[PDB]
Amino acid sequence: PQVELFVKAGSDGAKIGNCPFSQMLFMVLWLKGVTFNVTTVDTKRRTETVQKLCPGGQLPFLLYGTEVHTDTNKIMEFLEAVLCPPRYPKLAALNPESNTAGLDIFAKFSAYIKNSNPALNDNLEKGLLKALKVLDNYLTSPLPEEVDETSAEDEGVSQRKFLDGNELTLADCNLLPKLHIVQVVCKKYRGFTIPEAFRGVHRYLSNAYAREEFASTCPDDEEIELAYEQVAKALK
């Protein structure tokens, strides 16, 4: 059953551009173990093929057999329901709160980065830090699979690699691409790095960069930086 993901091209019109939703789906497809390919689209220079396939012009989109699917969340839910055991792993998180943890972070960063008002900068860095902190608390809070197993020096502190346990789940495919943007953009434009003291977050990002499903599907740092150049440069 043929599977082809269409994604937003970057600045040369060929390579992967900045698009967390595109990366999210590329991640799900990789984690499913399914045979798929990926076509980048220069949206300013669309092939007649892509034009016929997806008249609405939405990106990303998925061709599955003969059927075109748009809307990233809906595609994700479709992939989860159509690619099941025993042939493909379920990737849905077991704990519903894994799906909501960290979700307000991208919006705090969006306000932070778009801001050009100096008296509001310190408020906005704080809103972003507090959001990251709440994700940190999630990542260090033991989940039901870890019930009552510990180490005297680290009691009540989760050792798990990712949001919902030790395997990547749909919840990570959603958050990780957004959190990667946050990291790259804020370093480049705002002298900002996630504090060391957020150890859950740092371990998470570290175990994520160790995984080729995340790392190989990231657009280059340049591509993300260029995407944000106009909105980010505004703060004097």
Side-chain angles (χ1 to χ4, degrees):
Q2 300 70 29
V3 188
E4 193 191 356
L5 181 64
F6 291 79
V7 300
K8 161 69 111 187
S11 63
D12 62 356
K15 60 170 41 182
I16 315 176
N18 181 57
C19 183
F21 308 118
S22 276
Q23 191 183 348
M24 181 272 282
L25 291 176
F26 193 167
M27 282 179 71
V28 166
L29 289 169
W30 201 315
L31 290 164
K32 283 294 195 180
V34 70
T35 300
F36 68 110
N37 215 287
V38 184
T39 305
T40 67
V41 175
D42 193 341
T43 57
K44 298 178 209 168
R45 175 185 179 89
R46 297 177 180 256
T47 66
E48 293 162 345
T49 295
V50 163
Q51 272 156 193
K52 174 199 184 56
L53 274 191
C54 188
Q58 296 86 9
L59 273 181
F61 70 89
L62 181 80
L63 180 65
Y64 190 100
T66 69
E67 183 100 341
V68 187
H69 292 256
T70 60
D71 181 328
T72 288
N73 183 246
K74 287 199 219 140
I75 289 149
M76 190 199 63
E77 290 285 8
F78 163 77
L79 291 174
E80 176 72 359
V82 298
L83 311 177
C84 321
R87 305 164 51 175
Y88 320 89
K90 295 298 203 165
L91 300 166
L94 308 174
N95 303 289
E97 213 186 325
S98 297
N99 291 324
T100 49
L103 249 49
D104 62 347
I105 291 165
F106 200 60
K108 311 284 168 187
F109 149 75
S110 293
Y112 183 49
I113 207 59
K114 287 195 161 73
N115 174 55
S116 47
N117 182 338
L120 207 42
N121 181 91
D122 285 1
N123 170 93
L124 285 173
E125 189 182 7
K126 182 210 208 150
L128 176 57
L129 286 163
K130 169 173 179 335
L132 283 153
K133 192 68 212 183
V134 175
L135 172 70
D136 196 65
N137 298 345
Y138 186 71
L139 291 154
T140 70
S141 286
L143 294 180
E145 187 54 42
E146 38 210 308
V147 53
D148 284 332
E149 79 193 339
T150 43
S151 135
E153 201 147 323
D154 265 320
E155 291 155 347
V157 179
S158 196
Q159 303 299 331
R160 77 175 187 276
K161 287 180 300 162
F162 304 119
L163 285 161
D164 195 57
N166 275 341
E167 307 299 339
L168 297 156
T169 60
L170 294 174
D172 307 292
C173 309
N174 182 55
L175 177 64
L176 281 170
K178 293 173 172 159
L179 211 58
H180 178 76
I181 296 170
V182 171
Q183 200 155 28
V184 162
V185 183
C186 290
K187 265 168 195 179
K188 171 69 187 184
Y189 290 105
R190 284 279 178 296
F192 178 94
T193 54
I194 294 160
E196 293 304 332
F198 297 10
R199 311 276 187 203
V201 170
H202 282 292
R203 276 197 316 266
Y204 179 57
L205 293 173
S206 140
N207 295 287
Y209 287 102
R211 287 295 292 269
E212 87 180 331
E213 308 95 326
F214 171 61
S216 308
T217 65
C218 290
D220 296 6
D221 284 344
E222 219 191 351
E223 290 294 327
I224 309 194
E225 296 170 0
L226 275 166
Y228 277 85
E229 187 167 312
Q230 209 176 284
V231 295
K233 72 169 193 210
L235 185 69
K236 311 300 153 199

